[PDB]
Amino acid sequence: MKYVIGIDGGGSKTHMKISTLDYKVLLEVFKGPSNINSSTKEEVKRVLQELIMEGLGKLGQSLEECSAICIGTAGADRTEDKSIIEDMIRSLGYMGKIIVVNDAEIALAGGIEKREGIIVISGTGSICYGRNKEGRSARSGGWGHIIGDEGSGYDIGIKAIKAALKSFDKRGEKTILEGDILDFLKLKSHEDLINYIYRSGVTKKEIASLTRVVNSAYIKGDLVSKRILKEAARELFLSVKAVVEVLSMQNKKVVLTTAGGVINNINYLYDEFRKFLNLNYPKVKIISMKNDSAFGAVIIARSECD
Ligand SMILES: OC[C@H]1O[C@@H](O)[C@H](O)[C@@H](O)[C@@H]1O
Numbered sequence: 328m329k330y331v332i333g334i335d336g337g338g339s340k341t342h343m344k345i346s347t348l349d350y351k352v353l354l355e356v357f358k359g360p361s362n363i364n365s366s367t368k369e370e371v372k373r374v375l376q377e378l379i380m381e382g383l384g385k386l387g388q389s390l391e392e393c394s395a396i397c398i399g400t401a402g403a404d405r406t407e408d409k410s411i412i413e414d415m416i417r418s419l420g421y422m423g424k425i426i427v428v429n430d431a432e433i434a435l436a437g438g439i440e441k442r443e444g445i446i447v448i449s450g451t452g453s454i455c456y457g458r459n460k461e462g463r464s465a466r467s468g469g470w471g472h473i474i475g476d477e478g479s480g481y482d483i484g485i486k487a488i489k490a491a492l493k494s495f496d497k498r499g500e501k502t503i504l505e506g507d508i509l510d511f512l513k514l515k516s517h518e519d520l521i522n523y524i525y526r527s528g529v530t531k532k533e534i535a536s537l538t539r540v541v542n543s544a545y546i547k548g549d550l551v552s553k554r555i556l557k558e559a560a561r562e563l564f565l566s567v568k569a570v571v572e573v574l575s576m577q578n579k580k581v582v583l584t585t586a587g588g589v590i591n592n593i594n595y596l597y598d599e600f601r602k603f604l605n606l607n608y609p610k611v612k613i614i615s616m617k618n619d620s621a622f623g624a625v626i627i628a629r630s631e632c633d
Pocket residue numbers: 338400401402403429430431448451452453454469470471472476
């Protein structure tokens with residue numbers, strides 16, 4: 328009868344799981360990525376109500392039987408975002424437990440199934456979050472696409488375009504990104520790229536998708552592309568080093584896992600990241616995520632219930 332809702336409000340999509348209290352996932356629903364930092368409050372509210380009422384429609388149950396709802400989304404570390412999100416859910420008539428957290432917290436829960444450890448996210452954006460044996464948490468990075476996101480897919484895509492333009496205008500080393508980016512975007516000229524970036528309403532996810540071009544060019548032997556991937560791995564490592572140092576974990580065993588397409592898909596980048604960690608923090612044990620972030624939100628929600 329009773330159930331919990333876990334929502335991963337990620338940059339790739341919005342992903343909901345509804346689960347019984349025995350962790351049997353009854354259904355999962357996908358919507359478009361929608362975040363109050365990049366959409367209006369009205370746009371996000373509509374997605375949240377639609378998502379929740381939809382799943383409750385297929386499940387054939389009311390909000391009264393929902394024991395807890397956990398939502399993890401980018402930017403939800405700020406209490407300003409927290410209250411706005413809780414209000415949207417309260418406005419549906421939900422009267423139970425609501426837990427609003429940053430996306431890294433649900434990724435850590437789903438990845439490790441414990442409170443302690445470190446998560447690195449590199450998808451559209453990037454962040455590192457961890458919690459030590461003292462129960463104390465810390466984060467590094469996560470400052471968004473203008474003043475942060477180092478080593479993210481968005482950052483890789485911007486750097487790829489900059490390298491392609493420097494190749495074209497002779498400020499930088501020649502790279503096959505110069506033509507490969509235009510081919511990928513179905514564009515004819517270097518000027519079509521300007522209108523695409525500055526006028527077309529391109530999304531963060533679309534720019535981050537150029538990471539696929541960087542990976543393909545690296546496999547073709549492109550040196551500029553290899554260097555972009557290595558430096559992204561270095562930025563992700565720096566985010567771990569920061570959290571490890573802040574939490575006094577430099578000489579302790581730590582379990583670390585990784586989420587997002589950049590870090591988890593690209594063999595060279597993942598290998599470089601692991602090499603940096605193995606050399607500098609040999610007691611960090613790197614593992615794959617045991618479950619996805621939506622299931623992490625289910626764990627956080629259900630763990631607050633009897
Ligand atoms: O998705 C990883 C990170 O992306 C950044 O752009 C956001 O500011 C963070 O809140 C988020 O944790």
